[PDB]
Amino acid sequence: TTLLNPYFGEFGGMYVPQILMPALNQLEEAFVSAQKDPEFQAQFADLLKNYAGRPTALTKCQNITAGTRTTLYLKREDLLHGGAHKTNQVLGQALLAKRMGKSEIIAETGAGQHGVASALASALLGLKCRIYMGAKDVERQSPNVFRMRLMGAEVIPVHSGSATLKDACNEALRDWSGSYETAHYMLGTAAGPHPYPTIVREFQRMIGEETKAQILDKEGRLPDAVIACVGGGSNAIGMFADFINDTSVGLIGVEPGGHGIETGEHGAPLKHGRVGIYFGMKAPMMQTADGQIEESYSISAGLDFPSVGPQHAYLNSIGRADYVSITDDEALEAFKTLCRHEGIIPALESSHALAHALKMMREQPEKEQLLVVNLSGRGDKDIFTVHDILKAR
Amino acid sequence: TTLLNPYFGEFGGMYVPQILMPALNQLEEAFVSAQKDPEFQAQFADLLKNYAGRPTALTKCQNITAGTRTTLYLKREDLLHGGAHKTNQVLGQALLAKRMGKSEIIAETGAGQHGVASALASALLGLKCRIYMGAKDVERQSPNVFRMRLMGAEVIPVHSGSATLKDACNEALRDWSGSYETAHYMLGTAAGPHPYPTIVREFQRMIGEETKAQILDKEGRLPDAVIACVGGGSNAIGMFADFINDTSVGLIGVEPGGHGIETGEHGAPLKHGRVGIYFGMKAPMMQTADGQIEESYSISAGLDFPSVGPQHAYLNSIGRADYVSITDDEALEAFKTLCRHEGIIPALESSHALAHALKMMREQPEKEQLLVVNLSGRGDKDIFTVHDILKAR
Amino acid sequence: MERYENLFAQLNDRREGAFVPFVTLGDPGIEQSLKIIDTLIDAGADALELGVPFSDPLADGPTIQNANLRAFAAGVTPAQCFEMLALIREKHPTIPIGLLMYANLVFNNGIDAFYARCEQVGVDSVLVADVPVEESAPFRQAALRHNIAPIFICPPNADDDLLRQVASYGRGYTYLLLHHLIEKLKEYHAAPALQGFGISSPEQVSAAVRAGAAGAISGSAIVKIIEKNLASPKQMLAELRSFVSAMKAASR
Amino acid sequence: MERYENLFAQLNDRREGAFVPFVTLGDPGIEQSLKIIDTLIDAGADALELGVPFSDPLADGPTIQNANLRAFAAGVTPAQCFEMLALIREKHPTIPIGLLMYANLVFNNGIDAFYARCEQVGVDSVLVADVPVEESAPFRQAALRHNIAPIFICPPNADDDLLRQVASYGRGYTYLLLHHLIEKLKEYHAAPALQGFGISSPEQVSAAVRAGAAGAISGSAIVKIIEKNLASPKQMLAELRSFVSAMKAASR
Ligand SMILES: O=C(NCCOP(=O)(O)O)c1ccc(OC(F)(F)F)cc1
Ligand SMILES: O=C(NCCOP(=O)(O)O)c1ccc(OC(F)(F)F)cc1
Ligand SMILES: *Cc1c(COP(=O)(O)O)cnc(C)c1O
Ligand SMILES: *Cc1c(COP(=O)(O)O)cnc(C)c1O
Ligand code: NA
Ligand code: NA
């Protein structure tokens, strides 16, 4: 029994061991209560405004589009406190934990951005934060590890399995199953078992809500399409959600193509994986023919969640949203283009969304189209990555 | 002959070789014209809003002040595009260059933040940007150098003199004296020859204007004091300017004390230097007994301009503003405190301002005081600096 | 078949608890796992619980995570595990054999097909670790259509609604993790309860049966013996035999 | 004194231009600079322009930046430079001696005190590189109170207001950087013009005088000879003598 639908069509659900079910049920009830509570909403709005810096700007890109019939706007989640959209929903989940009487936060992280976001929310709200991170990722993400510890979080290296994100996901769940009376699990994307795909969407939905108000103010009409990268699905569903009922607005999600879909070295399970059951959910995922779970590969480690949020799989299945892929090389070119022509350093994650918009423009330059890219993060973290590749060429 | 007063009391002036005087006169006239031009003001306001992300938030710090009678707010220039306040005035100067028919930008930089700010403004506005930077600084600021080149700027290493900021300042001026018909010199602080101290103040004055509106909204009264770090003076004068006529509002500028004023290894010329004439201005500066110009030292390289803006020297001389110093160790502690207790990573520059506010609170914890710190920048750039020092302990 | 029902009736006729060890199929290799399992049976195991190595076993502790890694180091696949199961059933016609599965391995190539494969090799039950009763309908239905008992965990804090679901949906045995739960499970005509948490010594086997459970499941203690004796395959079997004999003796 | 006025009257009586070299005091060392300056005089220099090494010479090109660094490598201070100036004046009573200064070195310990020191060692003029005429009042006043001529640059694009200021405020000579400016400077009774930009060959000396200037100032060409001959002090003096003799001959 649940208050809300755990499924998006066939996708989603609550595929956890029985002992974790009370934790999910408790969390769903607190969320449903909080969504009815004007004081919860006002507290969340206040933190978003006065701490995180919302609303974020919507920036036109005339330099990039000159000579074409594309009008391009960037939704500037790179200007959010912390440098990425992840800050919106960790603040909401942190308030949810406090509503529930929890004093401790568990979080997983891959490339480390969700770890940093969970740590800063926890520091602000006086929660004791512990973060699970694959030992391989700890070794290769020292800047984010440092940030995490500077904000008082305990970073716990995971050595099990492949010791990457998916194994940190397992260890966070194991911990939560025994500690959930006093700890909240701050899941990092719009995936996992219900109620997480729904909660994360609702705590990210101001992205699309603001974009709609800003685009109506500046252009007098809704976009032809909004375009967002899809690693686990939280920034894309945050952009998409307020437009789902605007049937004329295209919703385009961009998965990482890595070295190319044909190489198999990619991160695009929604369009190139196989539906399975893992991470508490039924969703497309990277897996062997035998059903063992595999990794995603991208130049952008933030897109390496090896599955995808179930609402994206559902939106694809009914044709409401279209999903495409962008390769490492296309993302790198979009990164360079934005730096040179708008003075904005985009995250390599977000560069996947920008790259697909650039192809939409370039392929059909006399097509009238008003496009919004969700610029999910800033890309200071990527400048050495981009520097080394461009120097090796 | 000038349209505006080049002096702040005895400080300031136009101490350049004769050949540079027409460039300064031309710039003053264009600035005075632009300040009367509603269309210039609206263009500048639009870039600040929709590109840079203004207004920036004003964030209360209850976790830091708990148990005391201090109320602390941070003016969140760390959330500005580029990560520091420098973005406000480079956008205005870029528009000034375009108003003047210039197609090229010259800029100097030390630790590299002004270089990055000049490069991003130039990229946005289609200007050809060249940046002078001491060869020692080029070697030790590779991340900012990379950013500068990613945005299409030409970074030119200076090998003359001590090959630090002051020598990049000389080379930018030499270049401008022969190229000013087509190039604008984008000076990086509220110092140098008139009209630069005045222009930079006016292009940073929205910091204080917003702070006043935000503090009146949130507290119903003006602050008891506003506190800002002083390297060259631009973020402090931007905070201060709208409060100068509010005589009850204390203005506190914080110079870097380095290893300690008594060690002589510091960056506090306003209170511990000697008035001289250099950089086109009469101002306090770091200099030998003989009158050779010296360097400032701080753990924060962004505070190492070896003089100070003349309006700060004037505000000190009449008692309107008070200037103090904070040591490397005090700044490091404030950096750690903000990370742990508010989840905000401050620039080590800004950490000097925060540190002095913390001492104001801690020394007299039952003193009623409403304080605003100008959080001039974010401190991702400093996490390795802080990591290495804390690990060496 | 009715192997669990036959076993429990025979155990009841002897006033005896069941002892059920858990091991990972293929740990530390296919041939040594086959010998390990034969030794467990020869030492007096009443039934087996057998795990199929899975990449992300998010219900198992470190001891069993390591068993999975050892099996994967040996190249063990679910296909090979089913080959092993058929060999085991061929040697031992009556011992109940239960699998501990993760959902993706069941769902992967079709739920029905998985349970048909279970039936064809002679498996008796399947516990899917990450399928709560609320999500279980296609799994328990496919299980029952293929004469496989679907096993469900009854957590120590299970409320009355959960107890009723576990009693109605489970078959073969109830996996049980102040003996209140045992009495309520019997009140609701649940499958006989096997106690599965913290069974590492003979005293725990006797205590589980005394509380009213029909037996006890011990996996980590068995797997730890495999881990400790990796360099000495023969001493490993001898130590396995010693341990299971002592544990089984405590159920008499 | 009236050393510039005396020199120019004597040069006019010979229908002659002045040749004025620029060197940095103390480059490449105190003793060698003293020999360099004596060689310049002995070779026919009509007057000297002498720079005091300053840390941030933001009006000098690379050749002179390097001269400053060489002097600083030798430990040369403004105090030592004034000791040199007194020795030079003691050897040569009538040659006009001008300083090229940066403002901070003049302002440092008091503007009046600096110009008093200039008077005491026998300096004739001071050009402060970074003091435009608009800022010059305390400098030119202190100069004139101590019988020092304040020298001002007249830029090639100087407008009529600037020409009038330079004509009124300067003394000794006008530093000049279609001979329109020369005629306007004479029209405004300015101090006699010395051409200072791009004088590296004897042909340029003759051409500056032909245009109506009273002479020519050459520094980089002189300093470049010092730079080129650092390893050979004696060949340096010989090459200095050769060059200045040729340049001075072109003014006759
Ligand atoms: O991808 C996930 N987290 C985002 C990590 O953020 P980043 O720092 O960018 O790796 C993620 C984490 C957990 C999850 O479900 C479950 F808990 F069951 F594992 C599904 C996805
Ligand atoms: O300090 C200055 N620039 C700021 C550099 O920014 P950063 O990147 O933080 O070093 C600075 C630059 C020039 C100046 O006057 C003059 F042009 F004459 F030299 C005075 C101060
Ligand atoms: C984490 C991250 C993503 C991908 O995660 P989603 O949940 O798919 O949004 C994308 N962009 C940035 C900047 C990120 O930090
Ligand atoms: C450049 C800089 C400063 C110091 O320069 P001011 O002109 O004194 O403001 C301070 N904080 C930050 C973050 C800076 O980038
Ligand atoms: Na994914
Ligand atoms: Na300074």
Side-chain angles (χ1 to χ4, degrees), chain D residues 124-146:
Chain D
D124 297 291
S125 70
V126 176
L127 190 177
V128 192
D130 46 352
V131 174
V133 286
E134 291 89 341
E135 292 280 8
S136 61
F139 292 89
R140 60 190 209 256
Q141 287 152 15
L144 294 169
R145 285 198 296 278
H146 295 94

PDB file of all heavy atoms in Angstrom, chain D residues 124-146:
ATOM      1  N   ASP D 124      71.117  70.413 -13.707  1.00  0.00           N
ATOM      2  CA  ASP D 124      70.526  71.548 -14.408  1.00  0.00           C
ATOM      3  C   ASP D 124      69.040  71.406 -14.715  1.00  0.00           C
ATOM      4  O   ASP D 124      68.334  72.421 -14.774  1.00  0.00           O
ATOM      5  CB  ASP D 124      71.274  71.795 -15.724  1.00  0.00           C
ATOM      6  CG  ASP D 124      72.705  72.174 -15.497  1.00  0.00           C
ATOM      7  OD1 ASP D 124      72.941  73.290 -14.991  1.00  0.00           O
ATOM      8  OD2 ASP D 124      73.597  71.346 -15.800  1.00  0.00           O
ATOM      9  N   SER D 125      68.554  70.183 -14.931  1.00  0.00           N
ATOM     10  CA  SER D 125      67.159  69.961 -15.283  1.00  0.00           C
ATOM     11  C   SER D 125      66.708  68.608 -14.747  1.00  0.00           C
ATOM     12  O   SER D 125      67.522  67.730 -14.434  1.00  0.00           O
ATOM     13  CB  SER D 125      66.949  70.023 -16.800  1.00  0.00           C
ATOM     14  OG  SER D 125      67.541  68.883 -17.427  1.00  0.00           O
ATOM     15  N   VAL D 126      65.384  68.469 -14.632  1.00  0.00           N
ATOM     16  CA  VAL D 126      64.719  67.236 -14.233  1.00  0.00           C
ATOM     17  C   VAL D 126      63.468  67.088 -15.086  1.00  0.00           C
ATOM     18  O   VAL D 126      62.625  67.994 -15.130  1.00  0.00           O
ATOM     19  CB  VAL D 126      64.341  67.219 -12.735  1.00  0.00           C
ATOM     20  CG1 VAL D 126      63.549  65.923 -12.407  1.00  0.00           C
ATOM     21  CG2 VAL D 126      65.566  67.333 -11.838  1.00  0.00           C
ATOM     22  N   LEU D 127      63.363  65.971 -15.783  1.00  0.00           N
ATOM     23  CA  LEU D 127      62.148  65.556 -16.469  1.00  0.00           C
ATOM     24  C   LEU D 127      61.572  64.431 -15.627  1.00  0.00           C
ATOM     25  O   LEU D 127      62.250  63.415 -15.422  1.00  0.00           O
ATOM     26  CB  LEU D 127      62.483  65.067 -17.881  1.00  0.00           C
ATOM     27  CG  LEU D 127      61.351  64.801 -18.884  1.00  0.00           C
ATOM     28  CD1 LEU D 127      61.951  64.405 -20.231  1.00  0.00           C
ATOM     29  CD2 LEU D 127      60.376  63.738 -18.409  1.00  0.00           C
ATOM     30  N   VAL D 128      60.354  64.619 -15.115  1.00  0.00           N
ATOM     31  CA  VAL D 128      59.667  63.577 -14.354  1.00  0.00           C
ATOM     32  C   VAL D 128      58.721  62.857 -15.310  1.00  0.00           C
ATOM     33  O   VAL D 128      57.701  63.413 -15.746  1.00  0.00           O
ATOM     34  CB  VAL D 128      58.938  64.146 -13.126  1.00  0.00           C
ATOM     35  CG1 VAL D 128      58.509  63.001 -12.234  1.00  0.00           C
ATOM     36  CG2 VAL D 128      59.840  65.089 -12.336  1.00  0.00           C
ATOM     37  N   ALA D 129      59.054  61.603 -15.607  1.00  0.00           N
ATOM     38  CA  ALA D 129      58.445  60.892 -16.729  1.00  0.00           C
ATOM     39  C   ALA D 129      56.936  60.757 -16.576  1.00  0.00           C
ATOM     40  O   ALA D 129      56.199  60.846 -17.572  1.00  0.00           O
ATOM     41  CB  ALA D 129      59.082  59.517 -16.872  1.00  0.00           C
ATOM     42  N   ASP D 130      56.448  60.540 -15.346  1.00  0.00           N
ATOM     43  CA  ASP D 130      55.034  60.254 -15.112  1.00  0.00           C
ATOM     44  C   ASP D 130      54.300  61.407 -14.428  1.00  0.00           C
ATOM     45  O   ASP D 130      53.326  61.180 -13.710  1.00  0.00           O
ATOM     46  CB  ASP D 130      54.847  58.958 -14.315  1.00  0.00           C
ATOM     47  CG  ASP D 130      55.780  58.838 -13.086  1.00  0.00           C
ATOM     48  OD1 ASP D 130      56.694  59.660 -12.890  1.00  0.00           O
ATOM     49  OD2 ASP D 130      55.564  57.890 -12.294  1.00  0.00           O
ATOM     50  N   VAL D 131      54.739  62.637 -14.662  1.00  0.00           N
ATOM     51  CA  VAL D 131      54.048  63.832 -14.198  1.00  0.00           C
ATOM     52  C   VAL D 131      53.651  64.652 -15.414  1.00  0.00           C
ATOM     53  O   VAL D 131      54.467  65.371 -15.995  1.00  0.00           O
ATOM     54  CB  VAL D 131      54.916  64.655 -13.230  1.00  0.00           C
ATOM     55  CG1 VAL D 131      54.210  65.952 -12.914  1.00  0.00           C
ATOM     56  CG2 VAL D 131      55.153  63.875 -11.964  1.00  0.00           C
ATOM     57  N   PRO D 132      52.404  64.570 -15.834  1.00  0.00           N
ATOM     58  CA  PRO D 132      51.969  65.389 -16.966  1.00  0.00           C
ATOM     59  C   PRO D 132      51.893  66.855 -16.550  1.00  0.00           C
ATOM     60  O   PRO D 132      51.876  67.187 -15.363  1.00  0.00           O
ATOM     61  CB  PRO D 132      50.595  64.809 -17.290  1.00  0.00           C
ATOM     62  CG  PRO D 132      50.072  64.393 -15.928  1.00  0.00           C
ATOM     63  CD  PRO D 132      51.282  63.845 -15.192  1.00  0.00           C
ATOM     64  N   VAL D 133      51.853  67.749 -17.545  1.00  0.00           N
ATOM     65  CA  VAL D 133      51.818  69.175 -17.195  1.00  0.00           C
ATOM     66  C   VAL D 133      50.645  69.488 -16.278  1.00  0.00           C
ATOM     67  O   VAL D 133      50.742  70.373 -15.413  1.00  0.00           O
ATOM     68  CB  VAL D 133      51.769  70.067 -18.453  1.00  0.00           C
ATOM     69  CG1 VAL D 133      53.105  70.083 -19.126  1.00  0.00           C
ATOM     70  CG2 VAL D 133      50.675  69.621 -19.404  1.00  0.00           C
ATOM     71  N   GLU D 134      49.532  68.771 -16.447  1.00  0.00           N
ATOM     72  CA  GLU D 134      48.338  69.008 -15.636  1.00  0.00           C
ATOM     73  C   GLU D 134      48.587  68.773 -14.150  1.00  0.00           C
ATOM     74  O   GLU D 134      47.930  69.395 -13.307  1.00  0.00           O
ATOM     75  CB  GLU D 134      47.198  68.114 -16.127  1.00  0.00           C
ATOM     76  CG  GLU D 134      46.667  68.501 -17.508  1.00  0.00           C
ATOM     77  CD  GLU D 134      47.404  67.819 -18.665  1.00  0.00           C
ATOM     78  OE1 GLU D 134      48.545  67.336 -18.472  1.00  0.00           O
ATOM     79  OE2 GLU D 134      46.825  67.760 -19.779  1.00  0.00           O
ATOM     80  N   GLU D 135      49.508  67.880 -13.809  1.00  0.00           N
ATOM     81  CA  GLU D 135      49.845  67.546 -12.433  1.00  0.00           C
ATOM     82  C   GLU D 135      51.145  68.196 -11.974  1.00  0.00           C
ATOM     83  O   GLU D 135      51.670  67.829 -10.917  1.00  0.00           O
ATOM     84  CB  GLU D 135      50.008  66.031 -12.284  1.00  0.00           C
ATOM     85  CG  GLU D 135      48.753  65.239 -12.434  1.00  0.00           C
ATOM     86  CD  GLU D 135      47.898  65.242 -11.184  1.00  0.00           C
ATOM     87  OE1 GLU D 135      48.202  65.995 -10.216  1.00  0.00           O
ATOM     88  OE2 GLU D 135      46.903  64.501 -11.198  1.00  0.00           O
ATOM     89  N   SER D 136      51.715  69.108 -12.764  1.00  0.00           N
ATOM     90  CA  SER D 136      53.120  69.404 -12.547  1.00  0.00           C
ATOM     91  C   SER D 136      53.397  70.520 -11.548  1.00  0.00           C
ATOM     92  O   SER D 136      54.567  70.696 -11.184  1.00  0.00           O
ATOM     93  CB  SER D 136      53.803  69.764 -13.867  1.00  0.00           C
ATOM     94  OG  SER D 136      53.199  70.907 -14.420  1.00  0.00           O
ATOM     95  N   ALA D 137      52.393  71.262 -11.080  1.00  0.00           N
ATOM     96  CA  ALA D 137      52.679  72.506 -10.359  1.00  0.00           C
ATOM     97  C   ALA D 137      53.659  72.364  -9.199  1.00  0.00           C
ATOM     98  O   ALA D 137      54.644  73.114  -9.173  1.00  0.00           O
ATOM     99  CB  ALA D 137      51.381  73.155  -9.863  1.00  0.00           C
ATOM    100  N   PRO D 138      53.485  71.454  -8.234  1.00  0.00           N
ATOM    101  CA  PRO D 138      54.475  71.400  -7.150  1.00  0.00           C
ATOM    102  C   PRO D 138      55.858  71.007  -7.629  1.00  0.00           C
ATOM    103  O   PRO D 138      56.849  71.419  -7.014  1.00  0.00           O
ATOM    104  CB  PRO D 138      53.889  70.370  -6.174  1.00  0.00           C
ATOM    105  CG  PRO D 138      52.947  69.571  -6.976  1.00  0.00           C
ATOM    106  CD  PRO D 138      52.435  70.431  -8.075  1.00  0.00           C
ATOM    107  N   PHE D 139      55.956  70.270  -8.735  1.00  0.00           N
ATOM    108  CA  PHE D 139      57.260  69.852  -9.239  1.00  0.00           C
ATOM    109  C   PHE D 139      57.970  71.001  -9.931  1.00  0.00           C
ATOM    110  O   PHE D 139      59.132  71.298  -9.626  1.00  0.00           O
ATOM    111  CB  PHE D 139      57.099  68.667 -10.194  1.00  0.00           C
ATOM    112  CG  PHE D 139      56.640  67.413  -9.515  1.00  0.00           C
ATOM    113  CD1 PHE D 139      55.293  67.146  -9.371  1.00  0.00           C
ATOM    114  CD2 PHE D 139      57.559  66.496  -9.032  1.00  0.00           C
ATOM    115  CE1 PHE D 139      54.857  65.998  -8.726  1.00  0.00           C
ATOM    116  CE2 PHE D 139      57.127  65.341  -8.394  1.00  0.00           C
ATOM    117  CZ  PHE D 139      55.781  65.087  -8.257  1.00  0.00           C
ATOM    118  N   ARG D 140      57.290  71.664 -10.868  1.00  0.00           N
ATOM    119  CA  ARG D 140      57.963  72.755 -11.557  1.00  0.00           C
ATOM    120  C   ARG D 140      58.274  73.904 -10.598  1.00  0.00           C
ATOM    121  O   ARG D 140      59.326  74.537 -10.729  1.00  0.00           O
ATOM    122  CB  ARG D 140      57.141  73.204 -12.770  1.00  0.00           C
ATOM    123  CG  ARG D 140      55.758  73.701 -12.455  1.00  0.00           C
ATOM    124  CD  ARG D 140      54.920  73.897 -13.718  1.00  0.00           C
ATOM    125  NE  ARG D 140      53.932  74.955 -13.499  1.00  0.00           N
ATOM    126  CZ  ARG D 140      52.642  74.753 -13.276  1.00  0.00           C
ATOM    127  NH1 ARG D 140      52.104  73.552 -13.381  1.00  0.00           N
ATOM    128  NH2 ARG D 140      51.869  75.786 -12.960  1.00  0.00           N
ATOM    129  N   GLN D 141      57.405  74.165  -9.613  1.00  0.00           N
ATOM    130  CA  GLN D 141      57.676  75.230  -8.644  1.00  0.00           C
ATOM    131  C   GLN D 141      58.916  74.928  -7.809  1.00  0.00           C
ATOM    132  O   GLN D 141      59.786  75.792  -7.635  1.00  0.00           O
ATOM    133  CB  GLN D 141      56.457  75.433  -7.741  1.00  0.00           C
ATOM    134  CG  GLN D 141      55.311  76.126  -8.487  1.00  0.00           C
ATOM    135  CD  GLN D 141      53.923  75.791  -7.985  1.00  0.00           C
ATOM    136  OE1 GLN D 141      53.745  75.240  -6.904  1.00  0.00           O
ATOM    137  NE2 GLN D 141      52.920  76.123  -8.789  1.00  0.00           N
ATOM    138  N   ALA D 142      58.995  73.721  -7.251  1.00  0.00           N
ATOM    139  CA  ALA D 142      60.184  73.337  -6.493  1.00  0.00           C
ATOM    140  C   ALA D 142      61.424  73.356  -7.373  1.00  0.00           C
ATOM    141  O   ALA D 142      62.517  73.731  -6.918  1.00  0.00           O
ATOM    142  CB  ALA D 142      59.989  71.953  -5.869  1.00  0.00           C
ATOM    143  N   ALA D 143      61.284  72.934  -8.633  1.00  0.00           N
ATOM    144  CA  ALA D 143      62.427  72.982  -9.539  1.00  0.00           C
ATOM    145  C   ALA D 143      62.952  74.402  -9.667  1.00  0.00           C
ATOM    146  O   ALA D 143      64.135  74.662  -9.420  1.00  0.00           O
ATOM    147  CB  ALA D 143      62.038  72.423 -10.905  1.00  0.00           C
ATOM    148  N   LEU D 144      62.060  75.347  -9.979  1.00  0.00           N
ATOM    149  CA  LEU D 144      62.469  76.727 -10.218  1.00  0.00           C
ATOM    150  C   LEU D 144      63.003  77.392  -8.959  1.00  0.00           C
ATOM    151  O   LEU D 144      63.920  78.218  -9.045  1.00  0.00           O
ATOM    152  CB  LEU D 144      61.289  77.522 -10.777  1.00  0.00           C
ATOM    153  CG  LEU D 144      60.857  77.038 -12.161  1.00  0.00           C
ATOM    154  CD1 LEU D 144      59.552  77.675 -12.489  1.00  0.00           C
ATOM    155  CD2 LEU D 144      61.905  77.346 -13.235  1.00  0.00           C
ATOM    156  N   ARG D 145      62.457  77.049  -7.787  1.00  0.00           N
ATOM    157  CA  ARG D 145      62.980  77.601  -6.537  1.00  0.00           C
ATOM    158  C   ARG D 145      64.412  77.172  -6.283  1.00  0.00           C
ATOM    159  O   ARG D 145      65.128  77.852  -5.536  1.00  0.00           O
ATOM    160  CB  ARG D 145      62.132  77.167  -5.346  1.00  0.00           C
ATOM    161  CG  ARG D 145      60.786  77.888  -5.230  1.00  0.00           C
ATOM    162  CD  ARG D 145      60.219  77.729  -3.830  1.00  0.00           C
ATOM    163  NE  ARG D 145      59.912  76.340  -3.489  1.00  0.00           N
ATOM    164  CZ  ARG D 145      58.800  75.713  -3.850  1.00  0.00           C
ATOM    165  NH1 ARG D 145      57.897  76.301  -4.617  1.00  0.00           N
ATOM    166  NH2 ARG D 145      58.587  74.462  -3.436  1.00  0.00           N
ATOM    167  N   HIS D 146      64.835  76.048  -6.858  1.00  0.00           N
ATOM    168  CA  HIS D 146      66.185  75.542  -6.656  1.00  0.00           C
ATOM    169  C   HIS D 146      67.054  75.646  -7.906  1.00  0.00           C
ATOM    170  O   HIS D 146      68.055  74.932  -8.018  1.00  0.00           O
ATOM    171  CB  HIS D 146      66.105  74.108  -6.142  1.00  0.00           C
ATOM    172  CG  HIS D 146      65.485  74.010  -4.784  1.00  0.00           C
ATOM    173  ND1 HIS D 146      64.142  73.770  -4.593  1.00  0.00           N
ATOM    174  CD2 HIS D 146      66.021  74.157  -3.550  1.00  0.00           C
ATOM    175  CE1 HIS D 146      63.882  73.738  -3.296  1.00  0.00           C
ATOM    176  NE2 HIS D 146      65.005  73.968  -2.642  1.00  0.00           N
TER     177      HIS D 146
END
